[PDB]
């Protein structure tokens, strides 16, 4: 996260770290949506151009964390993966269309002050909240500039009008994406960066005070560049796939 700040304790209890076993290292962010299911970006797991094709046993998820590098004894929980599910129409060849994947955990995780699932939007919450100028929140342990943070970083960013997103990049954007960030000379900045992929873009509903995951950190060109914006997987647009996977595997 660029131009963010340290998260408060328990501020994002759905935040998940994707962790490589050998060598031990952060891979990506992710999010907790139930005691057995974790949401992330497909390109965190499968991206042939970078020779990235992880299998279940390559990976752990670490839940309830704050420090990036410490083993947070009596706070974090470390889970093994039962199964990885990648969207069948994930387009890694072209533009990361449908950049979404689910990971089912071997055992249910116990909730705590530091571990708690985020909500997924329904059509009414999506239509109400996903509007240009409305702000969401992105969290992660990724790079601080285009080094690395001691603890989880947070930044609040406005959703951008779709024509501005389109005109900011030569990459083809789809209805399964949205973009967010400040326009140049608006007086504020901030962006996700490498290592934040797979983490959640969340919004707090003013109707019921619940946090909803509207997006997944997906792609960008540089980090925090003027006139560029971060792109996010549109979670509601892929909700039917999410439900199909969960309503057929557990």
């Amino acid at each position: 996260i660029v131009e963010g700040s340290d998260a408060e304790i328990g501020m994002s209890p759905w935040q998940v770290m994707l962790f490589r076993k050998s060598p031990q290292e952060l891979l990506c962010g992710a999010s907790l949506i139930s005691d057995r299911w974790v949401l992330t970006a497909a390109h965190c797991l499968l991206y042939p151009p970078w020779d990235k094709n992880f299998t279940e046993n390559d990976l752990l998820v670490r839940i309830g964390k704050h420090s990036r590098t410490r083993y947070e004894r009596n706070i974090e929980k470390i889970s093994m993966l039962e199964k990885i599910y990648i969207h069948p129409r994930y387009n890694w060849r072209e533009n990361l269309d449908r950049d979404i994947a689910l990971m089912k955990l071997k055992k249910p995780v116990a909730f705590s002050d530091y571990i708690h699932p985020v909500c997924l939007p329904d059509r009414e919450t999506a239509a109400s909240l996903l509007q240009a100028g409305y702000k969401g929140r992105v969290t992660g342990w990724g790079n601080l500039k285009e080094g690395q943070p001691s603890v989880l970083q947070v930044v609040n960013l406005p959703i951008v009008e779709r024509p501005v997103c389109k005109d900011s990049t030569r990459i083809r954007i789809t209805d399964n994406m949205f973009c967010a960030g400040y326009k140049p000379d608006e007086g504020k900045r901030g962006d996700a960066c490498e290592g934040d992929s797979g983490g959640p873009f969340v919004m707090k509903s003013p109707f019921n005070n619940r946090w909803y995951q509207m997006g997944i950190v997906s792609w960008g060109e540089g980090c925090d560049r003027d006139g560029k914006y971060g792109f996010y997987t549109h979670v509601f647009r892929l909700k039917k796939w999410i439900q199909k996977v969960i309503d057929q595997f557990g």
């Binding site: 700040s5 408060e8 304790i9 328990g10 501020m11 209890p13 949506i33 139930s34 705590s112 002050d113 530091y114 708690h116 699932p117 985020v118 909500c119 997924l120 909240l129 100028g133 409305y134 702000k135 969401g136 929140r137 947070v154 609040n156 406005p158 919004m203 707090k204 509903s205 003013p206 005070n209 619940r210 946090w211 909803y212």
Partner: peptide, 28 residues
């Protein structure tokens, strides 16, 4: 999931974090 999106250290005890007001103010 019945209790999704409500944080133990914030919503559950009616405490607000330091910047969530910035989000609420943006929803016009």
């Amino acid at each position: 999931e019945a209790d999704c999106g409500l944080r133990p250290l914030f919503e559950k005890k009616s405490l607000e974090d330091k910047t969530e007001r910035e989000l609420l103010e943006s929803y016009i």
